[PDB]
Amino acid sequence: MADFSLATASQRKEWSNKAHMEYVRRSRFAPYIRNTENSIFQGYSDLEKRAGD
Amino acid sequence: MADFSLATASQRKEWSNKAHMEYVRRSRFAPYIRNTENSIFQGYSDLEKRAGD
């Protein structure tokens, strides 16, 4: 063209602020981890109290 | 016949104004092109703003 002809290295760009993450697929063992006695994977909060190894 | 016998090249014709088109079958990708983040084919309007290549 021969109108106002802007340069190739003078053309603007733009960078976005919103970023994407990668999917993780949380857990398939999550409904089965409880602290009661009739659970498959049983937890113990006895060392969350006073002390121990 | 031997009544009023009109000529073969003197018979009228008529041309219609309503025309037909060819079917196109719009798009099978049309419910899947959005601008959000949970879409399959994602669009970006960042160059529809100020400038860029």
Which backbone phi and psi does B41 adopt, to 5 degrees? -105, 110
Q: For residue B48, give the nearest of A6, A14, A10 by alpha carbon.
A: A14
Measured between CA atoms, how close is A2 to chain B, in angstroms?
19
Alpha-carbon gap, residue B50 to A41, rounded angstroms = 57
**Least CA distance to B44: which residue of chain A?**
A16
Alpha-carbon gap, residue B7 to B51, rounded angstroms = 71
Alpha-carbon gap, residue B44 to B30, rounded angstroms = 16
CB under 8 Å, gap of 24 or more: what pairs does B40-49 form? Answer: B46/A14, B46/A16, B47/A14, B49/A14
**Resolution of the model in angstroms:** 3.3
B12 alpha-carbon distance from chain centroid: 32
Strand, helix or coil for residue B42: strand
Residues followed by a gap in chain A, C→N > 2.5 Å: none
Alpha-carbon gap, residue B53 to B42, rounded angstroms = 18
A11 and B51 within 8 Å at the Cβ level: the answer is yes
* Exp. method: cryo-EM
